Amino acid sequence: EEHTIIQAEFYLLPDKRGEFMFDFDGDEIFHVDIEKSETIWRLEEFAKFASFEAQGALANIAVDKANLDVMKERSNNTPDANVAPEVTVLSRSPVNLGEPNILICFIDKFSPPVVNVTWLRNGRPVTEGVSETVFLPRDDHLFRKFHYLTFLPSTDDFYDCEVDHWGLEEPLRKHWEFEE
C-alpha cells in the first residue's frame, strides 16, 4: 500500500489569513476554520470515524504568524513575483439535459494562496448553489483549488468561471457550454 498524508499550514500577509488542513493521497480530509475554531470535514461521514482538537491548529498558526515576521526581516527585500493560475472548467459527471449536474472550476499552479472566483450563468453572477474548497497543496510550492456550481443542463445557456489573481493582468474567464 502506497499512501501519503500531508498536513499543510500557512499564514499570509497582508491579507492576514491562515490555514491548517490534512490531505490524504491528494484529497482533503479536513481543515480548521480559524475564525470559528472548528474542524470542517471535507465529507460529513468522516466525522464519525475520527476527531481533532482545533486549538492545537490555532496554536500552530500563531507560531507561523510570529515566524513570518522573522522571515520578513531575515530576507530583507525578499519580496518577489507570483504565479498566475491555470483555470479549467468541466462537468462533474456526464451531462444530460434536464438532469441537474455540477460544473467544476479547477484553479491550479498558483501562489500566493488568494483568489476571487465568480460563477457566471449567461454572464450573470451566481451565488446560490455554489461551494468551494480551501487552498490545497501540490507536490511543489504552489496551490490548487476547486469551486462548484449546481446547474440545470440546457442547450441555450452558457457558463463562465471568473478568476482574479494578483499574477493576472485582467481577470480570467473560462467558458463552458453543453453539447450533446
Binding site: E1, E2, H3, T4, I5, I6, Q7, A8, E9, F10, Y11, L12, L13, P14, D15, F24, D25, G26, D27, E28, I29, R42, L43, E45, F46, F49, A50, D64, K65, N67, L68, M71, K72, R74, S75, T78, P79, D80, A81, N82, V83, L90, R92, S93, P94, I104, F106, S111, P112, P113, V114, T133, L136, P137, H141, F146, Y148, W166
Partner: protein
C-alpha cells in the same frame, strides 16, 4: 503587490502499510523551499541560505530533535491507524457508458468514447476491444481527473472506422468491483 507567506508541509510517506514510514517536513517562504526535515536523515537541513539560521538553531536542541524524529510514530503511524479504518478502504463504483462522436470532419463516426466517472480510488483499468481483440493503438485519454470531493472521472477514447458487424467493448477493472465491467457498442 508585495506579499509574504510562511508555509509548511508535513508529509508522511507510507510503503506497504506502516511497514516503512518516512516523515518529510518542508518549509517555504513565498516561492522558495528553504529548509526541510527528512526523518531518514534525523535532522534539519537548509535548502537555501534563507533557511540556515533555523537549521543551526533547531539542530542544537537535542530535546526538540528527539521530538520530531518521534513524530514518525506519534503523528504518521498514529494517524495512519485512524485513517486505515475509513479512508484506506474507501471504494466507490464507477458509472460506465459508451457513446460515439465526430471530433473530426463528419459522416459516419470516428471516435468511440468510454466514459468512466464517479469512482474511487484513482487506480483503474480501461480497455477497448474490437470483436474480441484488444485495441492497443488509437487510444486517446483525458487522464485521471480528480474532482476534489473524493471521486474521479475519465474518458478513454478509441479512434475507429466502424464496419457493421463489428462489436466494440469497453472493459473497466477497478478495486470496488468484484468482476470487470463491460459495455458493448
Amino acid at each position: 503587490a508585495p506579499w509574504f507567506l510562511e508555509y509548511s508541509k508535513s508529509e508522511c510517506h507510507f510503503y506497504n502499510g506502516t511497514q516503512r514510514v518516512r516523515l518529510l517536513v518542508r518549509y517555504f517562504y513565498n516561492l522558495e523551499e528553504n529548509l526541510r526535515f527528512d526523518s531518514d536523515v534525523g535532522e534539519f537541513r537548509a535548502v537555501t541560505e534563507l533557511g540556515r539560521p533555523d537549521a543551526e538553531n533547531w539542530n542544537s536542541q537535542p530535546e526538540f530533535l528527539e521530538q520530531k524524529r518521534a513524530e514518525v510514530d506519534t503523528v504518521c503511524r498514529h494517524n495512519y491507524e485512524i485513517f486505515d479504518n475509513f479512508l484506506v478502504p474507501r471504494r466507490v463504483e464507477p458509472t460506465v457508458t459508451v457513446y460515439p462522436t465526430k471530433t473530426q470532419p463528419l459522416e459516419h463516426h470516428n471516435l468511440l468514447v468510454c466514459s468512466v466517472s464517479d469512482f474511487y480510488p484513482g487506480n483503474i483499468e480501461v480497455r477497448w476491444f474490437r470483436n474480441g481483440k484488444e485495441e492497443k493503438t488509437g487510444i486517446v485519454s483525458t487522464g485521471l481527473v480528480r474532482n476534489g470531493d473524493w471521486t474521479f472521472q475519465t474518458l478513454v477514447m478509441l479512434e475507429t472506422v466502424p464496419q457493421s458487424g463489428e462489436v466494440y467493448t469497453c472493459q473497466v477493472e477497478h478495486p470496488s468491483l468484484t468482476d470487470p465491467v463491460t459495455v458493448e457498442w
